[PDB]
Scaffold this active site. Structure first.
Site, PDB file in Angstrom:
ATOM      1  N   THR A 127      56.943  44.635 -25.772  1.00 58.79           N
ATOM      2  CA  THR A 127      56.735  43.608 -24.710  1.00 58.79           C
ATOM      3  C   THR A 127      56.707  42.329 -25.344  1.00 58.79           C
ATOM      4  OG1 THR A 127      55.897  43.025 -22.576  1.00 58.79           O
ATOM      5  CG2 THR A 127      54.677  44.110 -24.218  1.00 58.79           C
ATOM      6  N   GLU A 128      57.665  41.443 -25.569  1.00 53.79           N
ATOM      7  CA  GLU A 128      57.312  40.306 -26.109  1.00 53.79           C
ATOM      8  C   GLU A 128      57.796  38.869 -25.284  1.00 53.79           C
ATOM      9  OE1 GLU A 128      61.280  38.919 -29.214  1.00 53.79           O
ATOM     10  OE2 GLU A 128      60.026  40.757 -29.841  1.00 53.79           O
ATOM     11  N   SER A 176      47.770  44.127 -28.162  1.00 51.21           N
ATOM     12  CA  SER A 176      48.103  42.978 -28.326  1.00 51.21           C
ATOM     13  C   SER A 176      46.621  42.126 -28.509  1.00 51.21           C
ATOM     14  CB  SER A 176      49.086  42.222 -27.293  1.00 51.21           C
ATOM     15  OG  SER A 176      49.535  40.840 -27.876  1.00 51.21           O
ATOM     16  N   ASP A 234      44.072  39.341 -25.644  1.00 49.29           N
ATOM     17  CA  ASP A 234      43.665  39.170 -24.338  1.00 49.29           C
ATOM     18  C   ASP A 234      44.551  38.767 -23.133  1.00 49.29           C
ATOM     19  OD1 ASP A 234      40.957  39.889 -24.753  1.00 49.29           O
ATOM     20  OD2 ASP A 234      40.542  37.624 -25.701  1.00 49.29           O
ATOM     21  N   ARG A 239      41.434  30.467 -37.046  1.00 50.46           N
ATOM     22  CA  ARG A 239      41.869  29.142 -36.147  1.00 50.46           C
ATOM     23  C   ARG A 239      40.932  28.528 -35.387  1.00 50.46           C
ATOM     24  NH1 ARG A 239      44.709  30.396 -31.131  1.00 50.46           N
ATOM     25  NH2 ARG A 239      44.523  32.372 -30.707  1.00 50.46           N
ATOM     26  N   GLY A 247      42.466  32.868 -22.570  1.00 53.44           N
ATOM     27  CA  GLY A 247      43.285  32.181 -23.797  1.00 53.44           C
ATOM     28  C   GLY A 247      44.454  31.600 -23.231  1.00 53.44           C
TER      29      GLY A 247
END
Ligand SMILES: Oc1ccc(Nc2nc(-c3ccc(Cl)cc3)cs2)cc1
EC number: 2.7.1.91
Length: 347
Positions: A49-50, A74, A76, A182, A325
């Site tokens: 699932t992208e 993946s 959150d 990051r 997020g």
């Protein structure tokens, strides 16, 4: 400690975003997750699932009786989509009872980090984190978790499994477009030209009363056009660096943001930072967060309160928020916590 168990044996749906862990999520599943499942007698099927709203649509339409749990590999952000998918169903009341499992791949694994912490493991990272959370799934224990229901001025109702953040933290979640962390880099350079955000914050402390005034009903909430009920606390200061509603101990795999204990049923953490801190102190609060030592500074610009509901309104048009997020733009947001609404694997 556990309030439920997955059956042994069981079968499990794995939703995986292959663009996770700099595109190595599937490889990581194969190397780190698969061999442990075999030993634990856990069958699975991988569904990739992208694209946007994909996992949401799958989960919305799924026959959930074929699965003992849905495991989400993946960040959150995927868990977010899955939970909203289930809640958007006409049969949400029973659909939301499907045990969920969070396996960390990408970045933004605060949920997985929190569960790893609740289980009593060290604050590990990357592949060690993936291994620990898999071991939780192998052990099969289940715990119920709070859910956050949110409403926005445009009329959108959505659900949050982890956090709603505004101001500094939101700006940095957006300003980040990297692999690697990051957040440190983003915090550092937003710290440079520090800004304050103008808004109105109201909340409902765990001191709520014997009475009160399509998913569940948000009984604590009144429409955004009405003022908050008189028994709420309206915050006097209207200049913030950040506001943070957080349902768990961790904001990130190395951010132990909430070291005062784990949230009770129906309760979430509320943090805000009033305008007036120095850059240095913000950074110090940030770095101490790694060991959950930031509350030890007794900084008077940082406020913590346990709450069941809040409202936040900027104040100069629209504000940028981060929901678990993911980016969200709104004139005003309010929400309340529903207690022990979904189940997750955790020891
Ligand atoms: O996802 C993000 C998390 C933290 C940050 N940056 C910062 N967070 C903080 C902070 C301080 C206190 C608390 Cl309780 C939480 C966050 C200070 S600077 C940015 C993005």
């Amino acid at each position: 400690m556990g309030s439920g168990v997955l059956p042994r044996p069981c079968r499990v749906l794995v939703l995986l975003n292959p663009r996770g862990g700099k595109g190595k999520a599937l490889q990581l599943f194969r190397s780190h997750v698969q061999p442990l499942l075999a030993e634990a007698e856990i069958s699975f099927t991988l569904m990739l699932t992208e694209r946007r709203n994909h996992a949401r649509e799958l989960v919305r339409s799924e026959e959930l009786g074929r699965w003992d749990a849905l495991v989400v590999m993946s960040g959150d952000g995927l868990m977010h989509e899955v939970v909203n998918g289930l809640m958007e169903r006409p049969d949400w009341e029973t659909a939301i009872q499907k045990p969920l499992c969070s396996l960390p791949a990408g970045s933004g694994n605060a949920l997985a980090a929190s569960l790893n912490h609740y289980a009593g493991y060290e604050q590990v990272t990357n592949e060690d984190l993936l291994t620990n959370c898999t071991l939780l799934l192998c052990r099969r224990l289940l715990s119920p978790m709070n859910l956050l229901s949110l409403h926005t001025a445009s009329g959108l109702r959505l659900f949050s499994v982890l956090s709603l953040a505004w101001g500094f933290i939101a700006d940095v979640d957006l300003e980040s477009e990297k692999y690697r962390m990051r957040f440190t880099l983003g915090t550092f350079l937003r710290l440079a030209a520090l800004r304050t955000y103008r808004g109105r914050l109201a909340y409902l402390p765990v001191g709520r009363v014997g009475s009160k005034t399509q998913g569940p009903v948000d009984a604590h909430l009144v429409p955004l056009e009405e003022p908050v009920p008189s028994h709420w606390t309206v915050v006097p200061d209207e200049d913030f660096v950040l506001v943070l509603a957080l349902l768990h101990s961790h904001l990130g795999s190395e951010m132990f943001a909430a070291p005062m204990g784990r949230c009770a049923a129906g309760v979430m953490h509320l943090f805000y930072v009033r305008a007036g801190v120095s850059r240095a102190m913000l950074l110090r609060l940030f770095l101490a967060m790694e060991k959950g030592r930031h509350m030890e500074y007794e900084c008077p610009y940082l406020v913590y309160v346990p709450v069941v509901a809040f409202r936040l309104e900027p104040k100069d048009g629209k504000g940028v928020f981060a929901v678990d997020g993911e980016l969200m733009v709104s004139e005003a947001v309010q929400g309340q916590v529903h207690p022990n609404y979904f189940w997750m694997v955790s020891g």
